[PDB]
């Protein structure tokens, strides 16, 4: 019953079309609970889960402060990085940041993270010790030397082992009814002939939470990938997830195939057969 809290920030330059766009989102496990969008009219951090709505004006003000500050920081950093990479002023570029913390079933700190990208590639990352950085390239080594001189790892560590964990605990308590729930998958199979010699079997998992799931097709008790398709797990839109896995089988051999479903909400893994 480990839990995580994660923030995801994206800044995108749009030369000649206004200031960069900045978006922030926060999650507890697979549930979003806040957002900020620099293009929205409110200019505030806004709730997106029912259990955060009880937070008071001080909280909303402070959260809004923090993300506004990051948006402005990123406007400087976009300029800096364009210079490090010798890029023109006319192209759009992206900075992404993810950070957060994981707690155990006891609610104690397990791990913290902070990692940064540029144009969808690793740029710099805080190491697991929360004391040192890994730079992905020579431009990020410039940043790394600045950040060592600034003692930036200590400020990140203090947050990740402190405030991060404390607030993750609070949210887990306040949103307990939904955050600490598991919703097992509701499963079914579909079957469609595709020719006079093949048919498709598709194994469905619907309505599950958290998102982590495994679906596996077997023939004669052996996991298979020949003639299989597995889609990315996808949001239902109501806070639960969906996934399917399909296999093309020789007509008349459907009964040799089984779909195995693994999910935390299941007492034991399910075996489905047509």
């Amino acid at each position: 019953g480990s839990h995580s809290m994660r923030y995801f920030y994206t800044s995108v330059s749009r030369p000649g079309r206004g200031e960069p766009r900045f978006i922030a989102v926060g999650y507890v496990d697979d549930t979003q609970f806040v957002r900020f969008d620099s293009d929205a009219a409110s200019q505030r951090m806004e709730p997106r889960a029912p259990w955060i709505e009880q937070e008071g004006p001080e909280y909303w003000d402070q959260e809004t402060r923090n993300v506004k500050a990051q948006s402005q920081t990123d406007r400087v950093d976009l300029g800096t990085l364009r210079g490090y990479y010798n890029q023109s002023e006319d192209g759009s570029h992206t900075i992404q940041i993810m950070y957060g913390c994981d707690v155990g079933p006891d609610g104690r700190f397990l791990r913290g993270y902070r990692q940064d990208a540029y144009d969808g590639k690793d740029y710099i990352a805080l190491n697991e010790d929360l004391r040192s950085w890994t730079a992905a390239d020579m431009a990020a080594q410039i940043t790394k030397r600045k950040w060592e001189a600034a003692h930036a790892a200590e400020q990140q560590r203090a947050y990740l082992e402190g405030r991060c964990v404390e607030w993750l605990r609070r949210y887990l308590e306040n949103g307990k009814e939904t955050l600490q729930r598991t919703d097992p998958p509701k499963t079914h199979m579909t079957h469609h002939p595709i020719s006079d010699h093949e048919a498709t079997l598709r194994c469905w998992a619907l309505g599950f939470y958290p998102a982590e799931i495994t679906l596996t097709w077997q023939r004669d008790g052996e996991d298979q990938t020949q003639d299989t398709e597995l889609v990315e797990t996808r949001p239902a839109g109501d806070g639960t997830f969906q996934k399917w896995a399909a296999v093309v089988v020789p007509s008349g051999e459907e009964q040799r195939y089984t779909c195995h479903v693994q999910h935390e909400g299941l007492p034991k893994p399910l075996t489905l057969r047509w």
């Binding site: 920081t73 400087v76 950093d77 800096t80 990085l81 710099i124 410039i142 940043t143 600045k146 950040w147 600034a150 930036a152 400020q155």
Partner: peptide
Amino acid sequence: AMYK
């Protein structure tokens, strides 16, 4: 203060 953290700038890249």
